[PDB]
């Protein structure tokens, strides 16, 4: 764990108050399971590592990182108080890789592939109860 690479997203705090609903086993147990096991995942699997990626300038521009090895540990560790919270940061972890990536890099291409999937699953996502 390189100094040069910054803390990851928070994943434990007791002062945060947590809330299991079915909104969120739903992200747990349908949408991570389903793309946590794409061909695509594994650049999405954990922080990205800017030392061993030689991308020196990495956190100069994404200052909100996300990644599914961040969002698993929140999902199995009962972070979160709703499903808008878990899926922000689905959000976020695109949006860092399409802002930070030429369009059509390969690393576009596999967001992108998983994006579609994660968009049809949350359609799905349901109603609370």
Same mark, same amino acid.
């Given at each position: 764990?390189?100094?040069?690479?910054?803390?990851?997203?928070?994943?434990?705090?007791?002062?945060?108050?947590?809330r299991?609903?079915?909104?969120?086993?739903?992200?747990?147990?349908?949408?991570? !399971?389903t793309?946590?096991?794409?061909?695509?995942?594994?650049?999405?699997?954990?922080?990205?590592?800017?030392?061993?990626?030689?991308?020196?300038?990495?956190?100069?521009?994404?200052?909100?990182?996300?990644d599914?090895?961040?969002? !698993?540990?929140?999902?199995?560790?009962?972070?979160?108080?709703?499903?808008?919270?878990?899926?922000?940061?689905?959000?976020?972890?695109?949006?860092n890789?399409?802002?930070?990536n030429?369009?059509?890099?390969?690393?576009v291409?596999?967001?992108?592939?998983?994006?579609k999937?994660?968009?049809?699953?949350?359609?799905?996502?349901?109603?609370?109860?």
């Amino acid at each position: 764990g390189s100094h040069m690479n910054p803390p990851p997203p928070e994943t434990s705090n007791p002062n945060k108050p947590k809330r299991q609903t079915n909104q969120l086993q739903y992200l747990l147990r349908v949408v991570l !399971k389903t793309l946590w096991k794409h061909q695509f995942a594994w650049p999405f699997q954990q922080p990205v590592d800017a030392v061993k990626l030689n991308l020196p300038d990495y956190y100069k521009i994404i200052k909100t990182p996300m990644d599914m090895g961040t969002i !698993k540990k929140r999902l199995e560790n009962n972070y979160y108080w709703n499903a808008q919270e878990c899926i922000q940061d689905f959000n976020t972890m695109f949006t860092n890789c399409y802002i930070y990536n030429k369009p059509g890099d390969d690393i576009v291409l596999m967001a992108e592939a998983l994006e579609k999937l994660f968009l049809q699953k949350i359609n799905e996502l349901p109603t609370e109860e």
